[PDB]
Write a protein that binds this ligand. Structure first.
Ligand SMILES: *[C@@H]1O[C@H](CO)[C@@H](O)[C@H](O)[C@H]1NC(C)=O
Lengths: 48, 49
């Protein structure tokens, strides 16, 4: 679900936040992603 | 080619250009295949066509 505060378990990455479609440039090998100070910020959907 | 903790790692990038051999221009290397070999490697050699 998008645009709602939920608890996610993305491929073993457990956490809480709001997920929305991103406009980044994830290369095909890229999996997790992050932000400036070392926190998971943008995770690509493994299915879609 | 790197083989840290087994887990053979390779990276690749292709740049045709028109400059001479080995230009100074920068270029990144994207990973292509990461296969967990996990054996002992010391020697290295190539092949031809
Ligand atoms: C199953 O995973 C494969 C791998 O990408 C892909 O077809 C899709 O994400 C999934 N298919 C489904 C859920 O029908």
């Amino acid at each position: 679900v998008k645009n709602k505060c939920v608890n996610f378990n993305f491929n073993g990455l457990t956490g809480t936040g709001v997920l929305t479609k991103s406009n980044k440039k994830f290369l095909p090998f890229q999996q997790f992603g992050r932000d400036i100070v070392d926190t998971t910020d943008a995770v690509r959907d493994p299915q879609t | 080619f790197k083989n840290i903790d087994g887990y053979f790692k390779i990276y690749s990038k292709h740049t045709p250009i028109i400059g001479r051999d080995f230009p100074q221009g920068f270029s990144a290397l994207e990973p292509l295949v990461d296969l967990p070999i996990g054996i002992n490697i010391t020697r290295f050699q190539t092949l031809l066509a």
